[PDB]
Design an enzyme around this catalytic site. Sequence first.
Site, mmCIF file in Angstrom:
data_model
loop_
_atom_site.group_PDB
_atom_site.id
_atom_site.type_symbol
_atom_site.label_atom_id
_atom_site.label_comp_id
_atom_site.label_asym_id
_atom_site.label_seq_id
_atom_site.Cartn_x
_atom_site.Cartn_y
_atom_site.Cartn_z
ATOM 1 N N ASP A 48 0.768 -1.252 0.000
ATOM 2 C CA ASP A 48 0.000 0.000 0.000
ATOM 3 C C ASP A 48 0.809 1.320 0.000
ATOM 4 O O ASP A 48 1.328 1.765 1.030
ATOM 5 C CB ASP A 48 -0.959 -0.068 1.199
ATOM 6 C CG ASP A 48 -2.075 0.963 1.160
ATOM 7 O OD1 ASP A 48 -2.205 1.764 0.201
ATOM 8 O OD2 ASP A 48 -2.855 0.939 2.125
ATOM 9 N N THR A 49 0.840 1.983 -1.152
ATOM 10 C CA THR A 49 1.546 3.270 -1.275
ATOM 11 C C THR A 49 0.793 4.373 -0.529
ATOM 12 O O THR A 49 1.326 5.467 -0.309
ATOM 13 C CB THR A 49 1.706 3.687 -2.747
ATOM 14 O OG1 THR A 49 0.424 3.713 -3.370
ATOM 15 C CG2 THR A 49 2.609 2.709 -3.492
ATOM 16 N N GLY A 50 -0.454 4.091 -0.157
ATOM 17 C CA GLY A 50 -1.267 5.062 0.564
ATOM 18 C C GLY A 50 -1.248 4.885 2.080
ATOM 19 O O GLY A 50 -2.045 5.509 2.783
#
Lengths: 99, 99, 5
Positions: free
Chosen positions: A25-27
């Site tokens: 997850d880049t978020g």
Amino acid sequence: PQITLWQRPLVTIRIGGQLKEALLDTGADDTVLEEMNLPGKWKPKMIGGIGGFIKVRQYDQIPVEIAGHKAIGTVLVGPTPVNIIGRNLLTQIGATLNF
Amino acid sequence: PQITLWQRPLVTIRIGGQLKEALLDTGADDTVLEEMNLPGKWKPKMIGGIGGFIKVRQYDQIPVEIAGHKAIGTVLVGPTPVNIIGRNLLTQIGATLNF
Amino acid sequence: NXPIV
């Protein structure tokens, strides 16, 4: 490797001897794993997102293998619906977003 | 472009003629923007995040330009701590994870 | 949908 986003980017990670499935997850600023009894001292903390905040136990310097790549850092354990690998660990394995 | 993850992968997007800052989010199935008015009808929907479920307004077939790349898809508007561009639009611009 | 802040 190169991972397309047609499906959720789920991969196998290893932590505490256990093998698991986690979402890259880049978020996510942090790494959040579903409830598990890791030996170790921890500090309580709260993280939030859509829906609000949840209480989690913070564990530091935990060795985590993401698809053959070694990393070590802070791991939060709490009532999360999915295991999530955040930027704190993705930066260590050289993961980039490309388009 | 190739974006490293030392900082939140925030990029400028254009939607409804407006310019906004949004997070490229591989852990989000959907695109969710902070409350704003978009042209066209919307349908009530509910989505879940780390802290639980929220009610959102769903707008279909909305054109969005992400860092110059065009996408036309569903955009949800609701109480999110940050604007996020999810996998539904990231696949249209050909975004992939690499390490 | 996980930000995690």
